[PDB]
Amino acid sequence: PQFSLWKRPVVTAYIEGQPVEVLLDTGADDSIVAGIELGNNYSPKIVGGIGGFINTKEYKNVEIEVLNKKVRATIMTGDTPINIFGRNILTALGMSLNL
Amino acid sequence: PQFSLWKRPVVTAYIEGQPVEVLLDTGADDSIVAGIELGNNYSPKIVGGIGGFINTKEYKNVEIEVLNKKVRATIMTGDTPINIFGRNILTALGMSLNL
Numbered sequence: 001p002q003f004s005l006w007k008r009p010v011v012t013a014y015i016e017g018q019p020v021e022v023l024l025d026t027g028a029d030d031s032i033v034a035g036i037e038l039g040n041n042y043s044p045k046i047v048g049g050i051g052g053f054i055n056t057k058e059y060k061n062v063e064i065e066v067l068n069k070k071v072r073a074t075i076m077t078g079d080t081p082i083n084i085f086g087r088n089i090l091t092a093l094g095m096s097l098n099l
Numbered sequence: 100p101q102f103s104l105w106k107r108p109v110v111t112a113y114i115e116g117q118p119v120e121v122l123l124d125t126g127a128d129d130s131i132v133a134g135i136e137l138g139n140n141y142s143p144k145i146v147g148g149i150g151g152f153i154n155t156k157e158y159k160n161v162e163i164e165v166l167n168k169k170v171r172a173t174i175m176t177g178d179t180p181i182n183i184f185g186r187n188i189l190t191a192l193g194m195s196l197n198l
């Protein structure tokens with residue numbers, strides 16, 4: 001698939017079966033999702049964005065389905081205004097930025 | 100050129116001739132840089148992300164040299180923690196995000 005970036009590169013995904021809208025974000029190291037409930041097996045993490053820092057819940061080895069692929073990856077849940085798949089997932093998917 | 104996303108995609112750009120390192124960010128609609136003064140002809144705007152919001156100043160038709168290309172583009176200035184070249188610049192350069 002190819003994203004020409006005239007529109008946001010947004011897609012739908014499942015995270016442990018939970019449907020989400022996510023932004024493919026080359027500017028993010030991590031993948032941050034709001035709203036989904038992945039349970040109590042997490043570790044707290046601190047994530048910094050353009051405005052400051054948030055606490056997140058880090059879940060390892062989470063099943064994610066996106067772009068017709070299935071991978072395992074780390075998801076952090078917390079208060080992001082847009083759900084983002086960062087480079088930890090983009091690399092698992094084999095994505096690249098090209099010119 | 101290809102950015103494989105194992106590392107942050109950061110390159111050196113020249114904005115009105117001054118060198119800045121910038122992050123090539125598909126998750127950003129627009130571009131925001133710190134530490135460079137672009138003057139009194141702007142439109143104030145607020146942008147939001149993780150951690151909250153920041154005040155910015157939006158400048159039009161700014162000279163940018165990056166990835167051996169020269170373009171004229173919209174740039175915001177503000178107290179951003181990292182310099183971001185968002186989709187308005189990536190599309191001017193003809194960049195794409197591919198799987």
Ligand SMILES: CC(C)CN(C[C@@H](O)[C@H](Cc1ccccc1)NC(=O)O[C@H]1CO[C@H]2OCC[C@H]21)S(=O)(=O)c1ccc(N)cc1
Nearest residue numbers: 027028029030048049050082126127128129147148149181
């Ligand atoms: C959260 C996204 C919807 C929007 N952001 C772009 C995003 O790529 C930022 C860009 C970014 C990068 C570093 C620092 C601040 C912001 N990355 C980010 O917040 O990533 C966080 C998750 O992974 C971690 O790795 C980097 C910071 C953490 S943003 O910086 O808030 C932003 C919003 C609007 C514009 N026009 C430009 C930038």
Ligand SMILES: [Cl-]
Nearest residue numbers: 004005006007
């Ligand atoms: Cl597009």
Ligand SMILES: [Cl-]
Nearest residue numbers: 004005006007
């Ligand atoms: Cl489009």
Ligand SMILES: [Cl-]
Nearest residue numbers: 014016017018
């Ligand atoms: Cl499913």
Ligand SMILES: [Cl-]
Nearest residue numbers: 028029030088
């Ligand atoms: Cl990281």
Ligand SMILES: [Cl-]
Nearest residue numbers: 044045046047
């Ligand atoms: Cl941490």
Ligand SMILES: [Cl-]
Nearest residue numbers: 043045058074
């Ligand atoms: Cl960690």
Ligand SMILES: [Cl-]
Nearest residue numbers: 030046047048
């Ligand atoms: Cl972080």
Ligand SMILES: [Cl-]
Nearest residue numbers: 001002197198
């Ligand atoms: Cl391909």
Ligand code: NA
Nearest residue numbers: 138139140141
């Ligand atoms: Na003016």
Ligand SMILES: [Zn+2]
Nearest residue numbers: 004005006007
């Ligand atoms: Zn398009």
Ligand SMILES: [Zn+2]
Nearest residue numbers: 014016017065
């Ligand atoms: Zn499934």
Ligand SMILES: [Zn+2]
Nearest residue numbers: 008010021022
């Ligand atoms: Zn949407």
Ligand SMILES: [Zn+2]
Nearest residue numbers: 028029030047
């Ligand atoms: Zn991180």
Ligand SMILES: [Zn+2]
Nearest residue numbers: 029030047048
């Ligand atoms: Zn992080």
Ligand SMILES: [Zn+2]
Nearest residue numbers: 045058060074
């Ligand atoms: Zn971790």
